[PDB]
Paper text:
For this reason, we utilized the HaloTag system to efficiently deliver AzNP to the POI. HaloTag is an engineered tag protein that can covalently capture the haloalkane ligand within a few minutes in live cells with high efficiency. Since protein-ligand binding interactions and various “in-cell chemical reactions,” including the strain-promoted click reaction and photo–activation reactions, have been successfully realized with HaloTag, we expected HaloTag to be a suitable platform for our proximity photo-crosslinking system using an AzNP-conjugated ligand.
To test this model, we synthesized AzNP-conjugated HaloTag ligands (VL1 and VL2) with two linker sizes (see ESI†). VL1 showed fairly strong absorbance in the visible light range (λmax = 375 nm, extinction coefficient value = 2230 M−1 cm−1; Fig. S3†). In this model system, VL1 successfully generated the photo-crosslinked product of FKBP25-HaloTag and EGFP-FRB that appeared around 120 kDa only in the presence of rapamycin and in the blue LED light illumination condition. In this reaction on the FKBP25-HaloTag, VL1 containing the PEG1 linker showed stronger crosslinking efficiency with EGFP-FRB compared with that of VL2 containing the PEG2 linker. Notably, we used an ambient blue LED household lamp (∼0.057 W cm−2) for all of our photo-crosslinking experiments in test tubes and live cells with VL1, which highlights the sensitivity of AzNP and the requirement of only low-intensity visible light illumination. Since VL1 emits green fluorescence (λmax = 540 nm, Fig. S3†) and its fluorescence is increased after the photo-crosslinking reaction, we expected that targeting of VL1 and formation of POI-HaloTag could be readily tracked in real time in live cells, whereas other UV-crosslinking ligands (e.g., phenyl azide, diazirine) would not be visualized with microscope imaging due to their negligible fluorescence emission.
Residue numbers in the entry: 4 to 297
Write the structure that this text describes.
Amino acid sequence: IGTGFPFDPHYVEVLGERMHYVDVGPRDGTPVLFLHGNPTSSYVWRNIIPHVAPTHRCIAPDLIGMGKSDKPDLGYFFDDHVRFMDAFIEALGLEEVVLVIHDWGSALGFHWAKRNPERVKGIAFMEFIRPIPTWDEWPEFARETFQAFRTTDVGRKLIIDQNVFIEGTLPCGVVRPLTEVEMDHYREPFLNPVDREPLWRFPNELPIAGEPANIVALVEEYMDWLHQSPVPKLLFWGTPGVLIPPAEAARLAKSLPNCKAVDIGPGLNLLQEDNPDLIGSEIARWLSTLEISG
Ligand SMILES: CCCCCCOCCOCCNC(=O)CCN1C(=O)c2cccc3c(NNN)ccc(c23)C1=O
Ligand SMILES: [Cl-]
């Protein structure tokens, strides 16, 4: 599994800040927009993109405050990410897109899709944010930890002072061992402790046991939209998963219209790190089927 990141940096001004993105593949056709989550960057897509770039433009931004994007003194609420990603998409002049989305990137993508349904041609998603009705529906092995993340004093000590989301949670979200080179690529945006704000605000935004109520409502709304939409859907899942257990993947594969589900084998949260070639290959092939009328 490749450890390099052989993509030239592209930058665009967005709301007075600068955002970094990968941009490879042909200039024409429908672009494929790849959205990462917490605590990753476009690096998480590095072994997926080469499967898609022969046929499609691939655009993979770093969320504001993450990767090579700027780090303004924000709270990095989900609202902030929404504002910056909306502006990012307009700054590149994107019209119609296919979305490839993960974790908080899926919350961004689905919320954008709900508001711009005529511009989304397809959605490939994995380990995505859905409402978690009670803590029992959060995986046991991760319960204590995320409950601690969702406090001000203890959670900030863990995530900001001790960098636990990078040094601990991240490798615990991959079944295979991450190498030192991979770990250094994930560490790079957060070497300065004060820059770790997004890593702490994100788990505090997760829609768990009804809180925070604003995020729960927004996530329910885009899941309702997703259930009503005929847009082509491709769902990757692994065993045991984290956000999406196999039973829920099986349920969604039937409840969501026009949904193809693909089992990647053993996987936790960063499915891209455990089976990039299957995920990349299946996305490339599915993209081709979007042009077959049937
Ligand atoms: C968008 C969703 C992304 C999800 C990707 C999920 O990955 C699965 C996440 O499970 C694994 C999460 N992290 C670790 O184990 C790191 C190691 N670690 C520590 O050092 C520590 C040190 C001091 C106190 C504590 C503590 N407080 N009371 N025990 C509770 C937990 C830990 C801890 C603790 O855990
Ligand atoms: Cl999170």
